[PDB]
Design a protein around this ligand. Sequence first.
Ligand SMILES: CC(C)=CCC/C(C)=C/CC/C(C)=C/COP(=O)(O)OP(=O)(O)O
Ligand SMILES: CC(C)=CCC/C(C)=C/CC/C(C)=C/COP(=O)(O)OP(=O)(O)O
Ligand code: DMA
Ligand code: DMA
Ligand SMILES: [Mg+2]
Ligand SMILES: [Mg+2]
Lengths: 207, 205
Amino acid sequence: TPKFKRLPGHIAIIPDGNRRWALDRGLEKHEGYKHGIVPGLELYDICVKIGIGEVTFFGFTQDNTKRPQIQRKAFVDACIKSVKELSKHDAELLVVGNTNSDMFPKELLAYTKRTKFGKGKVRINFLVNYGWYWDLTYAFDSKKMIENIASAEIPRIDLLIRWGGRRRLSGMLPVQTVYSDIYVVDEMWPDFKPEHLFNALEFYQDQ
Amino acid sequence: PKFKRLPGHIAIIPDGNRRWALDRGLEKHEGYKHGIVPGLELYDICVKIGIGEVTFFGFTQDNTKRPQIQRKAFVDACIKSVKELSKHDAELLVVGNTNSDMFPKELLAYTKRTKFGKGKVRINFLVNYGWYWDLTYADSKKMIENIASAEIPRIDLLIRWGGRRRLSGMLPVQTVYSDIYVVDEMWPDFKPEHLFNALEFYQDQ
Ligand SMILES: CC(C)=CCC/C(C)=C/CC/C(C)=C/COP(=O)(O)OP(=O)(O)O
Ligand SMILES: CC(C)=CCC/C(C)=C/CC/C(C)=C/COP(=O)(O)OP(=O)(O)O
Ligand code: DMA
Ligand code: DMA
Ligand SMILES: [Mg+2]
Ligand SMILES: [Mg+2]
C-alpha cells in the first residue's frame, strides 16, 4: 500500500470481461464468472487494508438476464457465491436490485437490508438484477424523488474502476456516477491484480 | 479519413479553457473566446464526415458561481457559438434552466429545436444545465420521457477535452451506455485528429 494523500470515500467496480477471459483460456463463455469471485475478495481485502470505506460492485443488470440460460445461471451463481464469501469477512453488505422479478436470486433477498458481518470494516454494495431505468423510476415531492431512487442507500461514487477495457458506465448508478473519476483497466476482471487498484488510486489522488 | 462505423450522436465536453489560458500566460477568463473556433471546426468536420447529432456541454448551474469575469466570458462564448452555428445549416436546440437569471436571454430563441439553412446536423447546447434540475423536471414511464433534456437522445460517444475522465453530470440518462474518449489537451488546442482518434476508438468498440 503506497502513502496516499487522499483516498476515494466510495469506489465503484465494473468487473467486466469474464466471457472474453474464458474464451481466451479455451473455456465456455459461462465458465469465466467463477474466476471473478477471488478477484472480488482480493479487491475487498486490499480496500480494508488501505482504508477504503465503501465499494459498490456491479453484479448484473436486468439486460444481462436476457443472455442464454447457461450464462445467467453461471453469473447468478458467482454473484451469490461472492456475497456468501464476503459475509465471512468484516463487510457491511447491501444488495440493490429489482426484487419484484423472477430474475432476482432469492438467496440474495436476505441482503437487501444492509447487514454487518464480523467487524463491518467496509460497506460493500452489490447491484443484482439492477437497471438504471428501474432505479430512477422507483422514485415515483419531486425534490425528494432523487432521495427515493431504488439505490438511494448507495452514496455518490468518487472513483469508478472498470476492467475489460470498455470506457462506459453500462447504466451503473447514473445519479451516483455524475462526477465520478473513471479509470479503465484493459485486462479482463479475472486477470485482476493489486496494481490495477493502486494505479486507479494514484490517478484519483493526482486529480 | 474513412470510418467503418460512425456514432449517431456525439457529446462534447469542452473543458480546460482556464488551464489553457493560464499556460499561455493569459488571464483565466481569456480561454473561452479561443474555444469558439474549435466548436465551429468540430461542427464542420461532423457535417463533412456525416455525424447526425452533436451535444456540447456549454455550462452548468454550478459554473455560474465562478467570478463574474469568467462567467461573462464563457456565457459570451456560448452565445457566439450558437449564433455562428445558426448561420451554417445547424438544427439548434439549447437545453438549460430558463427559470433562472443565469440563463442567457439571447438563447431563449433556441429552447425549441430550430432548423437553420439545410439543417445538415442537430446541434444541442447545455446552458445553465444541472443533472438534478434535468431529472427532477419530471406515469413514471412518462416521467423519464419528460426530463428537461428529453429532446436530446441517447449519446453513442462522449469526447472530453482537458484530460479529466468524468461526466461532470452531463445528461445522466443519455450517457448510461456512451463510450467515453478523453483527449488530454485542453479544448482550445482542439485538432481534427482528436475527433478522428475518438471515432477510431468508437468503431473499434
Ligand atoms: C465481484 C463479482 C461480481 C464476482 C462475480 C463475477 C460476476 C458474476 C460478474 C458480473 C456479471 C457480468 C455481466 C460480468 C461482465 O462480464 P461479461 O459477461 O459481460 O463478459 P464480456 O464483457 O467479456 O462479454
Ligand atoms: C460549447 C462551446 C464550444 C462554447 C465555447 C467555449 C465555452 C463557453 C466553454 C464552456 C464553459 C466551461 C465551464 C468550460 C470548461 O473549461 P473550464 O473553465 O472548466 O477550464 P479548466 O478546466 O481549465 O478550469
Ligand atoms: C454488470 C456488468 C459487469 C456489466 C458490464 O458489462 P455488460 O457486458 O453488461 O455491458 P456493456 O455491454 O455495456 O459492455
Ligand atoms: C460545462 C463543461 C465544459 C464542463 C466542464 O466541467 P467543470 O470544469 O465545470 O467540471 P469538473 O470540475 O467536474 O471538471
Ligand atoms: Mg461485458
Ligand atoms: Mg473545468
